[PDB]
Amino acid sequence: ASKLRAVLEKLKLSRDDISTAAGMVKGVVDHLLLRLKCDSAFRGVGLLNTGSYYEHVKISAPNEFDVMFKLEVPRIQLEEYSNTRAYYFVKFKRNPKENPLSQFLEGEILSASKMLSKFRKIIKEEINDIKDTDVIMKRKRGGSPAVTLLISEKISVDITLALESKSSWPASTQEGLRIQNWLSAKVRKQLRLKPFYLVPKHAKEGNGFQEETWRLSFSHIEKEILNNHGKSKTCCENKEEKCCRKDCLKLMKYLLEQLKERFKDKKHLDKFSSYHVKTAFFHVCTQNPQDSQWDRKDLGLCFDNCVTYFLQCLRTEKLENYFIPEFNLFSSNLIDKRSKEFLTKQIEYERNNEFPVFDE
Ligand SMILES: Nc1ncnc2c1ncn2[C@@H]1O[C@H](COP(=O)(O)OP(=O)(O)OP(=O)(O)O)[C@@H](O)[C@H]1O
Ligand SMILES: CC(=O)c1ccc(NC(=O)/C(C#N)=C(\O)c2cnoc2C)cc1
Ligand SMILES: [Mg+2]
Ligand SMILES: [Mg+2]
Ligand SMILES: [Zn+2]
């Protein structure tokens, strides 16, 4: 409680660094968006700001920004890859209409690897052309849909191409977004009328990846929820309604970042990401729908609720994607049992000793 508030103080972002970093990111992004708009296929490219910075849960420093370069793909037809629920082949519906993505077709399917390749190429060539800022592209990460840029050796910007569909969400999402008792049935209905995105993250296929597959992304919905997260419409807008939901997410993120850092002899914890903790945190919100279950005075207890649910996810090897219930982020296919048992032991130790990892 006293300890957790002291940790939260240290995790706060500098107003000075937010102001500079935001301008540096704007300059790079605005410029890249302007170049992609010239290309016939990337004509309708649009910016969506996503991830922890724009959700106000980024911790320690504003040094990693996530952005979606969304592109409306009309008359899209999806084909679920090997019952994965989250990965799809992208096809096109019937009509003699001109297709701006004919270029990247590998038969009747829109290639994710080929479209990401060109997207990355246009960014690579533009980043080393016009100056006033020094921007370097980091090595392509296998599978990952992100094209990572580093601005003046300090701030990372993950840019993902995102196919935008204004059609009803895929059938795999029908039982997801279980926010009815928390944010309301009206809000769930309104959110599901919004577009959904496909990013070029490929499905794990043994040792490699199925390079034509795209994955569902709901980053825009996650942001909306985190920035309008209470049962009360006035949650965190006044001094009487200051909940500890975001503080609990920041503490879970820091717990995982700190354990990953200290066990930097690597491999054990490499597969665990902040998205696992974000997903587990949304499930704890569904489980504790009342703002009275996130009182600032109960910070210790609420954080423990988050820690025990995450420990349950690890032990049960179950962590459902919050939007795609049958997509298990903690399946043995994705994370071996050994790694989950290893993380369980470290989190149990931390929980039993009042989190020495948070000591200064
Ligand atoms: N495995 C995944 N499945 C689905 N969406 C994901 C996944 N990983 C990342 N994302 C989406 O991409 C966004 C940006 O990813 P990223 O790894 O930067 O995390 P973050 O939420 O921004 O937190 P932080 O950058 O502080 O660790 C996430 O907020 C989430 O919306
Ligand atoms: C290594 C690995 O397994 C892995 C899995 C998922 C991702 N990332 C996204 O799935 C993802 C989205 N969607 C994004 O990163 C977004 C979203 N909005 O901006 C950005 C950038 C990255 C890596
Ligand atoms: Mg991020
Ligand atoms: Mg990122
Ligand atoms: Zn609140």
UniProtKB/Swiss-Prot annotation:
Mutating residue 52 to D has which effect?
A: Phospho-mimetic mutant; decreased nucleotidyltransferase activity
Phenotype when changing residue 235 to A: Abolishes DNA binding and enzyme activity
Q: Which residues carry this modification: (Microbial infection) Deamidated asparagine?
A: 49, 228
N6-methyllysine modification, residue list: 345
Record motif Nuclear localization signal, residues: 134-144
List the range of the whole protein covered here: 162 to 521 of 522
- Organism phylogeny: Eukaryota, Metazoa, Chordata, Craniata, Vertebrata
Name of the molecule in the record: Cyclic GMP-AMP synthase
Effect seen on changing residue 34 to R: Induces alteration of the DNA-binding surface and leads to increased synthesis of cyclic GMP-AMP (cGAMP)
Instruction: Name the consequence of residue 271 to T.
Output: Found in patients with uterine endometrioid carcinoma; reduced nucleotidyltransferase activity
**Binding positions for GTP?**
50, 158, 215-222
